[PDB]
Each structure stands twice: as C-alpha cells, then as structure tokens.
Amino acid sequence: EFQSIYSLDKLYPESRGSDTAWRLPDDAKQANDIPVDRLTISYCRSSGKVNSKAEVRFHLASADWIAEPVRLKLAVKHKNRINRSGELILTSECSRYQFRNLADCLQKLRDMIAEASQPAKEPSREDAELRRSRIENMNRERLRKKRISSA
Amino acid sequence: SKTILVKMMSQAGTGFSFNTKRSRLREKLTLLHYDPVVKKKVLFVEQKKIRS
Amino acid sequence: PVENEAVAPEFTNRNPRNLELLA
Amino acid sequence: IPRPPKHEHYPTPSGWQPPRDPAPSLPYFVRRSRMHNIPVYRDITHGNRQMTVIRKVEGDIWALQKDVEDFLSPLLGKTPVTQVNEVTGTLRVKGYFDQQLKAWLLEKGF
Amino acid sequence: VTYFSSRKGKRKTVKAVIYRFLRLHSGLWLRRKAGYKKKLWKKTAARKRRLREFVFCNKTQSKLLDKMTTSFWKRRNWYADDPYQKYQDRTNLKV
Amino acid sequence: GPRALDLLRALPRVSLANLKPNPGSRKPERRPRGRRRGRKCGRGHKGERQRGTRPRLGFEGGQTPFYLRIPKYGFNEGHSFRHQYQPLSLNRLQYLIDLGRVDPTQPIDLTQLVNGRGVTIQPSKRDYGVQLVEEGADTFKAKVNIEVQMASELAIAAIEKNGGVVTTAFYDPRSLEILCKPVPFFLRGQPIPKRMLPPEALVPYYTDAKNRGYLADPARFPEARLELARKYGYVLPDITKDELFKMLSTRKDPRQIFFGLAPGWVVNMADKKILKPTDENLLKYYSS
Amino acid sequence: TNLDGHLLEPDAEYVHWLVTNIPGNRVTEGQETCPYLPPFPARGSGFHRFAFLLFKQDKRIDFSGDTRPSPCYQLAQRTFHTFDFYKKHQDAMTPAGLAFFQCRWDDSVTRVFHQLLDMREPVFEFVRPPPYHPKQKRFPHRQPLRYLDRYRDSHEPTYGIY
Amino acid sequence: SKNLGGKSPGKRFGIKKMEGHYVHAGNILATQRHFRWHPGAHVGLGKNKCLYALEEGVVRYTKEVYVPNPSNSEAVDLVTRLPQGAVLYKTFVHVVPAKPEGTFKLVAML
RNA sequence: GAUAGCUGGUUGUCCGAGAAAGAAUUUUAGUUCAACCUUAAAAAUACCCCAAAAACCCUAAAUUCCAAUGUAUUUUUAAG
RNA sequence: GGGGUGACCUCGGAGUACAAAAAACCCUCCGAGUGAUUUUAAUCUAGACAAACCAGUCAAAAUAACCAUAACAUCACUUA
Ligand SMILES: [Mg+2]
Ligand SMILES: [Mg+2]
Ligand SMILES: [Mg+2]
Ligand SMILES: [Mg+2]
Ligand SMILES: [Mg+2]
Ligand SMILES: [Mg+2]
Ligand SMILES: [Mg+2]
Ligand SMILES: [Mg+2]
Ligand SMILES: [Mg+2]
Ligand SMILES: [Mg+2]
Ligand SMILES: [Mg+2]
Ligand SMILES: [Mg+2]
Ligand SMILES: [Mg+2]
Ligand SMILES: [Mg+2]
Ligand SMILES: [Mg+2]
Ligand SMILES: [Mg+2]
Ligand SMILES: [Mg+2]
Ligand SMILES: [Mg+2]
Ligand SMILES: [Mg+2]
Ligand SMILES: [Mg+2]
C-alpha cells in the first residue's frame, strides 16, 4: 500500500497494474519455432568426468514445422547424424547441467535450420584439410581416366 | 662508440611503442616490426630517446 | 538381438599405412 | 527447529527421507541429528588422515561396528580399520565412506 | 610483527605482505615475479613472459605470510566477478 | 539399552572425590626442572636464541627479505569496497523448503532466509546480500516467490520453469543490517529509514529486465521471460492463472525495507503497536 | 579378402568375392563360392586393405565347408582366415597373382550397411591418450596460476554447502 | 693478488636421463656446453644445445655415423679432408616411443 | 626492569629417539633458508643393485642409472 | 694465516676438481661491465633443467604475418 517517488507506478506510468509483468504476449511471437513437445529428449548422466549428455531426437521426414526445401537440405548436409530410421539426432555434453545441454542442442538445431533456410549459402570449404583430398582425387582420376568399354 | 636507446611508435595508428638500442652517429631509425594490436607487419619510426 | 550388431568397440586396424594416410 | 512437513512421495526432491515408523530389531539405534539428518560426517587430521564418523549411536555399538565391517569388506577387499568410542557412542572408520554409510543407514531405516 | 598490540592487545598484521601478495582460501599464496617491470628492452620475450607470469609460494614462505597476516585475510570472500574465485578451492588433491 | 546405567548400580556413589578427565584431554605441562629439562632449558647455547633477542619474523639476517623483495601489485587493492554476495544454491533452497525451514507459500526474502538459517550475512564485512547460483538447478522442484540481490540466468530459468518469481533488489549496508536483524533494530527505538538507491555501478544491473531488477520496467518482464523460456526449452507457465498469484506478484517499494511496513514507522514491541508519523515534513522526507 | 573391417575379431578378415575352378581366363564361367559384396569400411577407422589373390591349382578341388549361400549377408559366415584356407588347400593351390588396394568410407557404405547387411552404421573416432600431468603438489613452488586448472575436473563452479 | 675472477659456480652440465629411463614429452634429456651427445629420433635440440624428449618413451644411447649438413662449412671441410675409409661416428640419444598415437573407439552406432 | 649478536647463571626421577655446517647476510662472536634430526599421520616402494648405457687427443682408484636378490626402509602431510 | 699497510669484493672460461653432478684458498692463468650487421626476432601453453629463497634456463602442440619447405636474430673462444 506504501508509495514513494521512486515507485514503479510513478517511474513508468505506461504500466501501472501489478499484472503487467505477468502477461503472456503470444502475439509478439506467433511463429512458434522448435515445438519442443514434438522432440524426443533424453538425458544420460555419466559420472565418476561428471557430465549430463543431452540427446534430442526427432523425425526429419515427419517434421512439418519446416519447409520441404529446408528438410531436403538438412537430409543432404547432415546425413552423417541421421539415424537409419530417419530420426535426426543432436547431442550435447559440454555442461554438467541438462538445462544448458538442452539449450546447446536447441541452438545447434537453430543454426542448422538457419543454414538450410538461407539461400545465400555459398558452401565455403577449408584448405588445410582439403588440399590432401584434392590431390588424392586428382591422382586417382589420373588412373581412372582409362577409357575401355566393359560389362 | 656509444649507443643510444630510442622508443619507436607504430605507424598503424594504434598506440604501441617499443625501445631498442641504436648507434648515435646513425640517422633516425625506421624498421618493420610486428604490431600485436593489428597483427600485421607495420613500419615503426623513431619517436623518442630515453637512455644514452 | 542382431547377430551382426556385435561391434567390439576397441577397433584394431592392422594396416601399417592407415595412420600414414590419415596424416 | 520446525519439524519436516509430510510429503506425498519419498524421497523428497532434495534427497531427504524420514525414518521408518517402527524401530528396527537391530541391537542399536543411530539417532537422527537435530536437523533430521544422518549423523555420518567426515573428518580430516594432519591434512592427510581421512576418517568417517558415525555419531549418536545408542545400544550395542559393537554390533554396529561388526555390521559396518561386513558391509565395507567387499568394497575394499579387506576389513576396514575402525575405532569404537563406547563412552561416547561413536564409530570412526579409516577412510571417506560418508555417502555410502548414509545410504546404508537409510536402507537400514535409521 | 606485533603479537600483542598496545591499544587493543590484539595481534597486528604487516601491510607489505597484503600489498604484494594474495592468499587463496586453500592456503596458497600468489605473487608477482620480481623484476617484471625493470629493463624490458634488455630481456628476451621468453624471459619477459616468465616475469609476467604469476607464481605460487612454497610451504615455508606460505607459513611465514600466514604468521605475518591476521585471520581477517584468511576468510572466505565472495566477491562480485572475482577472477580468482575458481582458484579459491582445491580439487583432486590426493595427499 | 544403556547398560552403563545398570553397571552404575554396583559402582559406588559418584561424587567430587572420584572425578577424572578424559585420557588425553589434558597434555601435562613441563617445567625447566631436573636433569633433562634443565641446563639451558631448551634454549640452546649462546647467541640470540638463548637470550631471547632474535630478530622479527620477516627478517633474514640482513638479506633483503622475501616479503619485501617482491614488487607491489594490486591484489587486495580496494578490497574493503568490493561488494560481496553470499551464494545460495538452488540445492540448498530446495533442502530448506523440503525440511520446512522456509515456506514457499509466503514471499521468501533475506529476513526469511536468515530466520531459516539458510544464509548468514555479515554486513560489516562488506556483504551486500545473497546471490543465486545454479548448483542444484536440475532437481529444483519448488515454486517460490524469491527475493535476492543477484541471480544467474540459469537459476532464474530454473525458477521460472517451476513457475516462481525472481527479483534482484538493492540494499545499502544499513538497510541490509536492518533486514537481516529486524528485532535488534526494533529494540533500538529508531524509525524505519528509507532504502537508499543503488550506486551508478549497480544501476544498469537493477534497471535491466534480463536480471529482473527491482527498478526495471515491468513491461519488459514478459519478453525476457519468453526469451529465457525459448532459450532453455521449457514452456512458460501461466502465472496469472495460479491460486497464489497475489503472493507470487507481491512486491516491495524501492524505498521499503520490510513487507507491509513503511519508512518512518516505529514498532513498539512492548505494547504491540505501530507509531506512524503525521507531520507533513516527516511524511515528505520518508516518502521521498 | 578384406584385411581390416572385421568388427569382432582383430586376427580375422572378411570375404568379399570367392570364385574357384576358373577354366583358363574365363572368370565368369567358374563357380562363385562367395557372391560379390561391396566394400563396407567403417566411417571412423578408414583406409582398409582389399586384396585379390589368384591361386593356380592342379586338381579339380571340391569342398562343401567353404561354400557360402546365395545371399551370404551374415558377417559370422563371412569370416575368413587365409592361413587356414591355404593350410586346407595347400596340396593343389599355389598363389601366383596378387592385387591389393586401399579403401575408405564414403556415402555408399551407409547404404551397404542398412540395405544389405541389415545393420546400423557403426561410427568410430581416432581418440588420443589423455595428456600427462605430474602428481599434484600441496604447495606448487613457483608454478603459474594455471597450475590449478590442469587438475580441474570440470570448468563449472561447485558450491559445496552454499 | 694478481689472479682474479676465478670464482664461478658449475653450470650443472651433464646427462639427466640415462638409458632405460621412461621419460615424457618435454623432459630435458641432457644439457651440455659443447656438442657431446647429439639428438636422434624424437629428441629435440634447444638453442643452448640441450636435448629434450619430443615423445614419451624409453631413452636409448647409440653410436651412429655422422653426416653433417652440407651448409656447415667446417664440418664439410673436415669431411672432404677425411681419408677414403674414414667414417665419422657420434653418440646419439634417442627416445623410443611406447604409447601408440591413438585408438579407434566406437562413438555412435547409428 | 635503558640496551646489550658479549660473559656468567638457569633448581626432581626414569625412559625413547637423537644432530659437526651448502647459500645469503656492515656477515663470518649472530641470524634466515636448505640438507640432516625429533614428534604425530597418510601411503609405497626404499637401500644392495649383473648386463646394457654416460665425448671428443692420453688417462688410475672408481662414479651415475638400473634388474634380480638380502633386508625394511623410504617418500609425502602437519608441527617444529 | 692478529690487526694496520698492500690486495680483493659482482659475472664467465681452463686447471685444482683424470670418468654423473657439486666442491674451497690473499691458488695458477684468461677475460666482462660491450661492439658490428639485419633475418627487428609475437601471443599462449604441455612437460622438464637448475636452485635455500630471490632469481636464472629450455620447450612440444595451438594461434596472426611472411616461403605456402625456416624464423633458435648472427658474429667477436659466446660462455660473462
Ligand atoms: Mg574436524
Ligand atoms: Mg617444552
Ligand atoms: Mg609454562
Ligand atoms: Mg636439559
Ligand atoms: Mg647445573
Ligand atoms: Mg658448543
Ligand atoms: Mg654461538
Ligand atoms: Mg651459558
Ligand atoms: Mg647489506
Ligand atoms: Mg559470510
Ligand atoms: Mg672455475
Ligand atoms: Mg663456488
Ligand atoms: Mg638485560
Ligand atoms: Mg655477532
Ligand atoms: Mg652396471
Ligand atoms: Mg632400483
Ligand atoms: Mg699467524
Ligand atoms: Mg687499504
Ligand atoms: Mg633437480
Ligand atoms: Mg610450434
């Protein structure tokens, strides 16, 4: 009931009720990205280093909250982390808190979605680790260039 | 043949000086040093004189 | 389970050129 | 100190658990602390001597010592070194076994 | 060291050690290398890095500093954004 | 059970004539008397050590001492002006709530914590209140209206996931002493003073919505809560639809110290009365 | 024969294509004892060796023990020991041809593992031994402040009782 | 009187690790004023002619032929001045690595 | 009750273990560290140590590091 | 090898000190209190030498710029 010159009501006259800080502005964000209810989240606490691995599995083909080109780009690029049952799986082991581990998994998913959604991706590759593969491919095509019909 | 101690400042704009020994009978010193602020090879010119 | 699913996590590569090719 | 509130599920989220309603038939009773915790602490001496102290024991403390040695023998492969203060009602095991002894006393219902 | 003061009868502490030393709660004392600001043009980059690096004290010097400091400097301090808060404790010390 | 009580029957009466301390509780003092402990009495031969004139501690026999050869560097420079915050883990808070020391049905404050013996605040040691850490954020299942001075993002998120309210307020040393020990202050005979504002070093921390500052704009609180929820992957509960929403949303005035009381009131605990000022200058000074 | 790639036994090898009783040069006319199987090296452990060995024989060797079925997708049945094979067929067979090549993992090994072998693709990694640190001292004399970080279990603040 | 400055401590120039000692990476094998022991396999060379281990293993000491750098003029001149059957031999210190480079562990069976 | 790194003196019994000096110092009549030693406490390797190994013009007695073996000692922690 | 006079006081090399290390004398001899030149020679960090302490020494991996193959500045007994 007490009031002063520095009270919140006298400091910010735009918001005077006590319930303005407890509203749920669903209109601000209507996209509703990452529907966590549709994700399979598992925690494995390995102790003895002590760390809680978080594993986020979700069916990529059944993921309808992303566009079809985005899903195709995911299935093309991140096929190394896609289960044989089609379930894309992300894993985090950095922090000991499952909260931070799940946050890291969600951030990885956000980066993947953004990289597959932006069309300005130039697909830049490194050089220190790719020069060897390039030389090996050239030296193997130097032998593959034989032209003789068979089969 | 007495030497001289001169403090040379970078020419890449960032404040970074280093001291070096030089000959007294020589002209104003100007070298190419490494500036860790810009991480490049920057020209360093003789700015001040500290010790004889 | 699947009889082919045995993995024996300690995989031994007796190829003397393996690490040399892997740099 | 207020008595702990009754919860619908045990153990509580903080890992606390009250004793059993009846008393066990063991010839000894490890009375809870004034904060309703198990009186199993750890002690350090000379900077390198690590001991575990079980306090607030009422009854045949030799039976508790025997049970503690029978419980700690398979973990170390040998009988652990123990001291029994009978006039105080205190057991002192050589080593850090506080968590294991707490879990053991919880299973025993103390 | 004044073991018994004249006003309060308490034990005093020397201020030089608190001016040029830092005590971690685990008993370790942290200090700077002597000469890390003297004639930097005459020294090699490796020697300059060795001088700039912090260093610990051994058992005798640590006990000496504990004798010269009071109990106010051996307390647990919870500072806001303390860089040495991660070093205030000791882990995996199998003695 | 206590067979010693039955053994005491055959033993004679316990009196002041048969009383012995514990063996080893009293190390006997030894005096410089006899053939062994005499004859220089543990001091040695001539010099300064037998005559009791050896130099002070840091002295090394004229050599420049170790405690003076090391260069001065700022390690404790301004240590008596660094704000200290006693840490309180969510694990310890859950332990207190589960053991019944603090009640989640009421707004939890520093006074409630010190009453429940969860934290000990030494304001003379530059302590500035309690900070919240996240050491037990995984198993925190309590819905409380917590009031701390500093909080971490993980702790705030762990409290919001259960559906509580976190708020970081400021207390100058005098108000902190009063809030920690209110009864010793009520027995003092002084009116409740005003709560001083945080300095410029802490104003950006307490006027920020991400820190849930008590001086922050209440319009930005739901946005920050939604950001924390979408970052940590938990659904933000409808706090306004709770039966204890009044207790969850109860607040303190930035000039107020206690709940329900006001600056300028005198609590007469002998007669159970509250003397309130009526003077216009008194009221203006106490409400400024 | 695939020398590296057997997941269970280290001292054993895999069969990929065994065809005996070749009349002269016509390899297709000879009966294939083991149907052809594509190389399936794991993703982590790379650069396996695959060797074609050609043996010349005198008699018409007939065997029912070394025969493989027509699908032949069982890794337990596709386990070879060239030493024992040559010990069994040492009287007639004599090795005269050899051609070995290296092979690493590509995007078809997942297909070979899933469709043909009916398995999950095993992924390995080249881990390194942990770095050596001396016994931690009580008073590390003249050591840098980062001495205490070499023996840290995790870079997370742990508040014991607070 | 006339002879001054002859007082100087020994620089402790010697061999730290002997043959058979299990050393770690960075362990100084031997310090020297002049080139007495030459580095061989997995043994580095500091600018003060000191020898340190680059790998973790067992130290060995061998006698091996000496082929100098074609730029070191003094050594090349001595080489070309040697007779037709002469071969320079030196004492080399090696480190035979014991631990393997790494192992292949199964991280995920997807 | 000045101060003395200087001299002198320093009061019961018995038992256990038990030290001859490297470095600084207006320091060599003294102190402070190290190495020894005492009292407790944690551990595990401790001495003896055959091969093999330790430089180039000549170089003795012998050293360093090491298995086995014969013994039980040694290292850290806290007070000194 | 009493003090006084004379000489010395810090650092490095060789012998004493023959082969791991250390090792004194008002012991026998050399020297240093810097010059010349350009490759102007970084950050961070495992692990080690040496050492009472203070100080002194090396150094793998990783990082920014130059060959896309070196960077320890070099020489003056290089040690001072
Ligand atoms: Mg204790
Ligand atoms: Mg005494
Ligand atoms: Mg006395
Ligand atoms: Mg005596
Ligand atoms: Mg006498
Ligand atoms: Mg005497
Ligand atoms: Mg004397
Ligand atoms: Mg006397
Ligand atoms: Mg002096
Ligand atoms: Mg406190
Ligand atoms: Mg000499
Ligand atoms: Mg000397
Ligand atoms: Mg006197
Ligand atoms: Mg004296
Ligand atoms: Mg021998
Ligand atoms: Mg031995
Ligand atoms: Mg004489
Ligand atoms: Mg004179
Ligand atoms: Mg040493
Ligand atoms: Mg490098």
Short mmCIF file of N, CA and C (backbone and C1' of nucleotides) in Angstrom, two decimals, chain E residues 61 64, chain F residues 55-69, chain I residues 22-27 30-33, chain J residues 52-54:
data_model
loop_
_atom_site.label_atom_id
_atom_site.label_comp_id
_atom_site.label_asym_id
_atom_site.label_seq_id
_atom_site.Cartn_x
_atom_site.Cartn_y
_atom_site.Cartn_z
N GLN E 61 57.48 -20.10 2.95
CA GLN E 61 57.04 -18.73 2.70
C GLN E 61 55.55 -18.57 2.98
N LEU E 64 55.13 -18.34 6.67
CA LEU E 64 55.61 -17.03 7.10
C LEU E 64 54.56 -15.95 6.85
N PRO F 55 65.86 -11.58 15.78
CA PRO F 55 65.07 -10.55 15.09
C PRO F 55 63.64 -10.97 14.81
N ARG F 56 62.90 -10.11 14.12
CA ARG F 56 61.48 -10.32 13.89
C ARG F 56 61.28 -11.43 12.85
N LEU F 57 60.03 -11.62 12.42
CA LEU F 57 59.70 -12.76 11.57
C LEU F 57 60.28 -12.60 10.17
N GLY F 58 59.88 -11.53 9.47
CA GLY F 58 60.30 -11.35 8.09
C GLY F 58 61.79 -11.12 7.90
N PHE F 59 62.54 -10.91 8.98
CA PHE F 59 63.96 -10.65 8.87
C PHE F 59 64.71 -11.92 8.49
N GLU F 60 65.73 -11.77 7.64
CA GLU F 60 66.52 -12.90 7.16
C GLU F 60 68.01 -12.72 7.40
N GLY F 61 68.39 -11.88 8.36
CA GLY F 61 69.79 -11.70 8.69
C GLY F 61 70.48 -10.66 7.84
N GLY F 62 69.77 -9.57 7.54
CA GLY F 62 70.31 -8.50 6.73
C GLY F 62 70.01 -8.62 5.25
N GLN F 63 69.84 -9.84 4.75
CA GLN F 63 69.44 -10.03 3.37
C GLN F 63 68.07 -9.40 3.14
N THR F 64 67.89 -8.83 1.95
CA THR F 64 66.61 -8.22 1.60
C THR F 64 65.51 -9.27 1.68
N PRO F 65 64.50 -9.09 2.53
CA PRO F 65 63.56 -10.17 2.81
C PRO F 65 62.71 -10.53 1.60
N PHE F 66 62.13 -11.73 1.67
CA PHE F 66 61.24 -12.17 0.61
C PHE F 66 59.95 -11.36 0.59
N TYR F 67 59.42 -11.02 1.77
CA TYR F 67 58.19 -10.26 1.84
C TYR F 67 58.38 -8.78 1.50
N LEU F 68 59.60 -8.36 1.17
CA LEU F 68 59.87 -7.00 0.73
C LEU F 68 60.53 -6.93 -0.64
N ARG F 69 61.09 -8.02 -1.14
CA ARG F 69 61.71 -8.01 -2.46
C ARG F 69 60.70 -8.20 -3.58
P G I 22 79.43 -26.99 4.19
"O5'" G I 22 78.75 -27.30 2.79
"C5'" G I 22 79.05 -26.53 1.64
"C4'" G I 22 77.80 -26.13 0.89
"C3'" G I 22 77.51 -24.64 0.83
"O3'" G I 22 78.27 -23.96 -0.15
"C1'" G I 22 75.55 -25.78 1.43
P A I 23 78.63 -22.41 0.05
"O5'" A I 23 77.23 -21.67 -0.08
"C5'" A I 23 76.47 -21.75 -1.27
"C4'" A I 23 75.25 -20.88 -1.19
"C3'" A I 23 75.49 -19.47 -0.69
"O3'" A I 23 75.99 -18.62 -1.71
"C1'" A I 23 73.62 -20.37 0.42
P A I 24 76.44 -17.12 -1.37
"O5'" A I 24 75.07 -16.31 -1.42
"C5'" A I 24 75.06 -14.92 -1.19
"C4'" A I 24 73.85 -14.50 -0.39
"C3'" A I 24 74.11 -13.45 0.66
"O3'" A I 24 74.20 -12.15 0.12
"C1'" A I 24 72.80 -15.17 1.59
P U I 25 75.54 -11.30 0.33
"O5'" U I 25 75.25 -10.49 1.67
"C5'" U I 25 73.96 -9.96 1.92
"C4'" U I 25 73.62 -10.00 3.38
"C3'" U I 25 74.69 -9.47 4.32
"O3'" U I 25 74.71 -8.06 4.40
"C1'" U I 25 73.81 -11.50 5.16
P U I 26 76.06 -7.25 4.09
"O5'" U I 26 76.82 -7.24 5.49
"C5'" U I 26 76.17 -6.79 6.67
"C4'" U I 26 77.11 -6.03 7.57
"C3'" U I 26 76.47 -5.24 8.70
"O3'" U I 26 76.29 -6.02 9.88
"C1'" U I 26 78.04 -3.88 7.53
P U I 27 75.23 -7.23 9.94
"O5'" U I 27 76.05 -8.50 9.44
"C5'" U I 27 75.55 -9.81 9.61
"C4'" U I 27 76.57 -10.86 9.24
"C3'" U I 27 77.92 -10.75 9.91
"O3'" U I 27 77.93 -11.35 11.20
"C1'" U I 27 78.21 -11.10 7.58
P G I 30 78.35 -16.99 16.51
"O5'" G I 30 76.88 -16.39 16.47
"C5'" G I 30 76.39 -15.60 17.55
"C4'" G I 30 75.31 -14.67 17.08
"C3'" G I 30 74.13 -15.34 16.40
"O3'" G I 30 73.17 -15.82 17.31
"C1'" G I 30 74.91 -13.58 15.04
P U I 31 72.00 -16.79 16.79
"O5'" U I 31 70.93 -15.79 16.17
"C5'" U I 31 69.86 -16.28 15.37
"C4'" U I 31 69.54 -15.34 14.23
"C3'" U I 31 68.71 -15.95 13.12
"O3'" U I 31 67.32 -15.90 13.42
"C1'" U I 31 70.55 -14.76 12.20
P U I 32 66.41 -17.20 13.26
"O5'" U I 32 66.10 -17.25 11.70
"C5'" U I 32 65.50 -16.15 11.04
"C4'" U I 32 65.53 -16.32 9.55
"C3'" U I 32 65.29 -17.74 9.06
"O3'" U I 32 63.91 -18.05 9.01
"C1'" U I 32 67.15 -16.80 7.93
P C I 33 63.43 -19.55 8.74
"O5'" C I 33 63.60 -19.73 7.17
"C5'" C I 33 63.67 -21.02 6.59
"C4'" C I 33 64.32 -20.98 5.24
"C3'" C I 33 64.79 -22.33 4.71
"O3'" C I 33 63.74 -23.09 4.15
"C1'" C I 33 66.51 -20.75 4.44
P A J 52 70.44 -24.58 -3.34
"O5'" A J 52 69.03 -24.14 -2.75
"C5'" A J 52 68.24 -25.05 -2.00
"C4'" A J 52 67.38 -24.33 -1.00
"C3'" A J 52 66.47 -23.25 -1.56
"O3'" A J 52 65.27 -23.78 -2.09
"C1'" A J 52 67.58 -22.46 0.38
P C J 53 64.63 -23.18 -3.43
"O5'" C J 53 64.24 -21.68 -3.04
"C5'" C J 53 63.21 -21.42 -2.10
"C4'" C J 53 63.19 -19.97 -1.71
"C3'" C J 53 63.13 -18.98 -2.86
"O3'" C J 53 61.81 -18.78 -3.36
"C1'" C J 53 64.81 -18.31 -1.35
P C J 54 61.58 -18.42 -4.90
"O5'" C J 54 62.34 -17.03 -5.09
"C5'" C J 54 61.88 -15.85 -4.46
"C4'" C J 54 62.81 -14.69 -4.70
"C3'" C J 54 63.07 -14.36 -6.16
"O3'" C J 54 62.03 -13.60 -6.74
"C1'" C J 54 65.12 -14.38 -4.98
#
